[PDB]
Design a protein around this ligand. Structure first.
Ligand code: IM5
Ligand code: IM5
Ligand code: IM5
Ligand code: IM5
Ligand code: IM5
Ligand code: IM5
Ligand code: K
Ligand code: K
Ligand code: K
Lengths: 243, 243, 243, 243, 243, 243
């Protein structure tokens, strides 16, 4: 009776789920909660049940990239999840404004994947749910953590080559705030499946400035802590509606 | 020195602008305000300076369809508008839930135009400003007017032919709430020009059921009055910030 | 029951219709006819019954842009129109040859809209009826009015941004003569609905040279007069075969 | 020093060129002229100088299909041809109206090739020159040969498979008259190179009814001689202008 | 210092790399080697140095999906890998011929990802190196394991929805043998980076018949043993050239 | 009765067919055989039965370009051909490595045609049969003829214009070795029709350096002899498996 990739049962799926890319990040989140229960670890998908401020919700890793995260999101969305919040990292597309360590809460995303397009026509928007977005912003100000807001580029390409020009500069000029690899996919899947979604992200560098060393995948520790508390806060607040 | 199509000067543009498709609707709105100043009327573009709740904002008609409304929106965005709210009509894509005369406040749109695509790659989301969306919803709530929230399909096709299948049913299945013709264009132009946008829409029928007589372009009178009140309410609230 | 946007009845549609973008141009035209009858004015759609040289035909405004004019053209084509001639303005794409105030009679157009693509695959030509084209040229010759002939770019973008390159220069290199916003839409809708179409256009400037001040939307009055007489001449000649 | 595939020199190219697909057709045409001179025959490209009604023009075969005919057309257009008329065969897409052996003179074409798209954006129309079209029509009238006029589908696919549906029926519904494989390519190359083009075509069958035996590769003898006479007629009329 | 996601140094990269999607599979493979050294485990990327039949090559997991595996493959290809073989699972697209547990060695793949398209135009083939394909086939016959050969569909969609039809049936009709999620990405990256690639795959079910219960995540043990033996045999053969 | 374009019967079709672009090349090949029998010559399609090393196989010309050669390949594949090897010319895309007169044996091709796309989606690879490739290579080895292996660009454009950039440079950077016009079309049709295919090509120049005079379609005589002997050798070896 188990889900194919998450290897947990439908009965173990909570109304609220916090997803992250890195399985290691699940272990850092779970030790911040009041208690947890380890559930499964299959491939890159690590699932834990988090207990926080009297509420119960899953934390699950989805892996790097849209195709792999989509299998995670589908398994969640078709088996009872109502709210999914991604807490991720990102690169900055506004290096004058948004620096390594900064936190962005994103309402919408650029669909530079394939899987969303195999689900719905390209003209359809990757947009998060306002309530999820609103509660992430509200927790951040309650915790007195400055955050940015904007659009994320969700791109399937991490290492550009020099044949086809990358569109990242185009999107920067179009006022996209940040870039990562999974948010647009989450948003689209959630819209199609009537699941509310949201996204909060921590800058790990600037892809325009990698050749200058503007990169470190060791996330700024006090900001990673801040982001986590914001995410956990939002999840508990949203979970109360369904408990 | 007048704007090419609006035929008003740059100094006559206010921070907040309420836009509608029908130039006749501009006259319905202006008489509900505390007072107004008729500014110009050229082609389909009628501009009026509205005074409401101690605030000053333009109401400008943009005409039918994305290419013609983009001309209006560019003229506003490039000459000082900071917030643009579209108060339009729409068809229902959820005839079971959303009926003639109902009001939808939309946060995002399907880009079934061409202009947006001539401006930015298709993967980029047509999304409204979530703070405009919030204001609109809060005004509706304070006026005790039930509203729907959701994605609008903005389609350049009004009259389908029999050769190419229309994607309207696909988008209904994807959970799009309504269909009109301008919102996606406003949203994308706003995002590119750093202008906050939003959309409130009144249902005039259901396109899947036109052949049953489920259409009346005389908009339901008290609901149109309600939508206008909401739009005017939101405009004056937003205008206070730039005053 | 009236047509939804034209608000005239099926019985008021003549075999031949002259269409223009600007409702203010309907008044310029009707005034050089032997007589006329005002029919309706709804949104940007002004309809007038023109009497000229013993014939009867409508003059109707279609508004700015492909989506809004498609609504007009479909209401006409599905309710009796057999010949539609657009008398519009355009920009020059050949500034060394075609100058402000010149008249172009176009046989074909580039489909840079969306609505035609929602009707028929992009590979399909936007092409005018060759007899309508011939009639327009012949009337111009009888009136001793020099004209140009060639392809029009019908583009949904009037105000380009600086992210995606505009294709206007590519089309100029491909020998397109002029640029407007409605003609390809008319042509395609006409071909699909078995309605004969054509277009005559007066140059208002050159979009490659707008920043040199090569623009004035006050059309050169003696050339506007000339284009109207050519257009009216052609409508009456064509209307005789349906009278 | 010769053209690469035609194996004739630039000075052997005349202002007017008649092109056909089948090298065998070149020999059927040359025999009807007042006299001729064989020039070359390389690959599928046979070139003959025709003398007819006091004029001289080349007759050149282009072979089957857009990529190979484009080599021929580029070598003509870049080396002095001012006018190119394709006299070809075609399938009927309107079996009730256009029968085996009927003649169609086409003004435009559907671009279902690739080479035109490698030259100019898809939205660009494949359209013939009016004077060429007019001349072909007038010669048919003088010879009392009944003809049809319409749009040709130029498709790179002759034998459909069962995976991707053919667009022929779509185009039939869209009112395209006939189907062949070279005309759109000629038209686009001609427009780009400032060469006047046109097409006259003889029906050899109906692709919707091949399984019922509505196909003969042996062209109706008196209609072929009729089509050849119209084309030879038109080439001589047009050649007079450049002589 | 270290590769961003693999977390190993340039100097630890061997000429030959065996890649698998599942980190758990790396543990099953190292066990059958003569010996090994655990190198690193970060995210879904587990790396192990294999010692087999006198030769040294890496075994690295790439995770589920094109965008995630592309990160792995790029880090390998730009830091000295010369040969990469993917040893994965797949679904069958020819259920009448290729059944659960069967092994397929694939020469080419369908590019239903996004990342390959962000590197090179869609018309470019996803193809493996013939020598790698030959080696794999030669190793299978020597070990006496019957294998299938064919094209793999690499698709970013694992769980189809009901809006856009899946292309799997089309590709089955086109004679594609199997489906997985990464091979096309590997092939294209390798071609671009001058790295020889190949793929060997074990059938885990048939997506056409998942609702018939034709699926098991547990790959049949004696066939997984066989595949790994082939793969390990091939890697050692290929390693000898660069030693 | 006869195939429509080849004008031979189903019973004259052999299991193995050597195809060439130039009807002239069929005559060059047949006289190197032990004997032959002329079958048919219609349009650009010359057909000859070749007797070589105790085997019997067709040699058939397909003309220039993808649409015309698809006509040939479909007639062959649907009427009993099992193996088809193209022996063609090509231009070099690696002018510092691959020179005029060199021979390349290709395993895959870039699908820059239209017809393949009207048969199967663009994501599908144009790939040759790996046994045919192996046989061609082993024949060259045994005849001591040095060859290159690689991907060919199959392009419908021979003469680029200056509006849309040619992708040849992009494909050179992507490591494609040569350019011709028909190989991708053969490969895709073969895969769909379950016919083994392959390609051997002789370099006639470099398209990047045509303006330097780096081109001669008079193919280097001893290398053309070498290519033919390789081609004939492989056809005979492959024919033994069906005889
Ligand atoms: N595309 C992209 N994604 C990211 C991310 C976010 N995730 C980090 C991980 C790859 O390092 C993927 O799961 C996406 C951080 N920085 C960047 C960047 O510069 N680019
Ligand atoms: N596409 C579409 N738009 C609308 C609208 C909205 N506007 C009404 C006007 C056309 O009637 C355009 O400005 C769009 C109302 N109902 C519908 C519908 O059924 N369809
Ligand atoms: N796109 C475009 N259209 C026009 C037109 C034609 N119409 C004028 C009006 C916009 O001013 C639309 O209805 C299109 C004149 N000049 C130009 C130009 O420079 N560009
Ligand atoms: N596509 C297509 N072309 C044609 C043609 C025209 N030419 C005939 C020849 C293929 O037989 C090509 O040069 C195109 C006649 N009938 C048909 C048909 O049914 N289909
Ligand atoms: N798309 C797809 N992939 C696979 C695979 C191969 N991998 C298994 C894993 C998803 O379970 C991905 O890394 C791809 C096995 N079966 C199937 C299937 O039915 N479908
Ligand atoms: N596209 C292309 N094809 C070729 C060929 C191969 N064939 C030669 C003939 C046109 O010259 C077509 O059948 C393709 C040789 N050289 C070249 C080249 O430089 N370019
Ligand atoms: K309009
Ligand atoms: K040919
Ligand atoms: K992954």
């Amino acid at each position: 009776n188990l889900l194919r990739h998450l290897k947990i049962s439908k009965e173990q799926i909570t109304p609220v789920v916090l997803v992250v890319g890195d399985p290691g990040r699940v272990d850092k989140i779970k030790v911040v909660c009041d208690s947890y229960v380890d559930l499964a670890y299959n491939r890159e998908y690590k699932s834990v049940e988090c207990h926080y401020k009297g509420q119960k919700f899953l934390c699950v890793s989805h892996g790097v990239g849209s195709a792999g995260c989509a299998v995670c999101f589908e398994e969640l969305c078709q088996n009872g999840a109502k709210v999914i919040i991604r807490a991720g990292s990102c690169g900055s597309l506004q290096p004058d404004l948004i620096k390594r360590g900064d936190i962005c809460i994103c309402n919408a995303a650029v669909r530079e994947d394939r899987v969303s397009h195999l689900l719905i026509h390209g003209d359809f928007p990757a947009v998060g749910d306002f309530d999820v977005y609103d509660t992430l912003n509200k927790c951040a100000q309650e915790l007195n953590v400055p955050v940015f807001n904007g659009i994320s580029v969700s791109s399937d390409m991490y290492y550009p080559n020099k044949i086809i020009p990358s569109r990242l500069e185009d999107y920067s000029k179009a006022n996209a705030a940040v870039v990562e690899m999974e948010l647009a996919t989450l948003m689209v899947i959630g819209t199609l499946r009537k699941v509310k979604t949201g996204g909060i992200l921590i800058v790990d560098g600037c892809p325009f400035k990698w050749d200058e060393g503007d990169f470190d995948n060791n996330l700024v520790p006090h900001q990673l802590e801040n982001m986590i508390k914001i995410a956990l806060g939002a999840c508990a607040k949203l979970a109360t509606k369904y408990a």
